[PDB]
Amino acid sequence: STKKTQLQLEHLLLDLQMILNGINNYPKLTRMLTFKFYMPKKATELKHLQCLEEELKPLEEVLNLAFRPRDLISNINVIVLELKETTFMCEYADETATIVEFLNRWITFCQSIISTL
Numbered sequence: 300s301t302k303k304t305q306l307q308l309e310h311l312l313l314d315l316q317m318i319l320n321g322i323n324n325y326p327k328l329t330r331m332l333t334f335k336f337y338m339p340k341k342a343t344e345l346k347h348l349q350c351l352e353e354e355l356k357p358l359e360e361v362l363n364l365a366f367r368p369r370d371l372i373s374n375i376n377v378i379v380l381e382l383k384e385t386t387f388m389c390e391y392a393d394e395t396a397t398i399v400e401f402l403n404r405w406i407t408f409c410q411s412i413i414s415t416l
């Protein structure tokens with residue numbers, strides 16, 4: 300059970316990393332930063348993945364406007380939902396962020412959980 304959680308988080312880490320790498324390869328990059336995302340106040344536990352889940356449709360939107368995007372987010376949606384049974388109301392920070400800041404924060408979040416086992 301613990302190994303399946305570690306490999307799920309690693310798969311989530313790769314997918315977010317795959318998006319961020321393609322974003323840096325793009326004038327076009329400046330236009331992609333106008334798209335704003337809601338961010339968590341503090342992401343420490345696995346329960347906070349509800350903040351990412353809520354922002355997956357907005358993530359699909361920006362990838363469509365730029366990158367199949369519908370197939371990629373569908374895979375992320377399953378993994379996130381499988382990783383988090385518990386109803387947790389998510390808390391969003393006062394400041395919104397760009398696509399680059401959104402991805403990097405969740406990449407760092409994923410790297411924190413893998414380290415805590």
Ligand SMILES: CC(C)C[C@@H](NC(=N)N)C(=O)NCC(=O)N1CCC(c2cc(-c3ccc(OCc4ccc(C(=O)O)o4)c(Cl)c3Cl)nn2C)CC1
Pocket residue numbers: 326327330331333334335336337354357361364365395
């Ligand atoms: C209040 C806000 C936090 C709520 C938020 N929802 C949420 N995250 N929960 C939301 O709705 N945000 C959406 C948003 O921020 N938008 C503003 C930007 C909009 C937008 C961007 C582009 C867009 C256009 C063009 C683009 O690039 C193509 C291109 C080709 C070449 C060049 C160039 O030379 O610059 O530009 C790209 Cl990457 C994008 Cl993202 N199209 N539109 C309408 C979408 C809505």
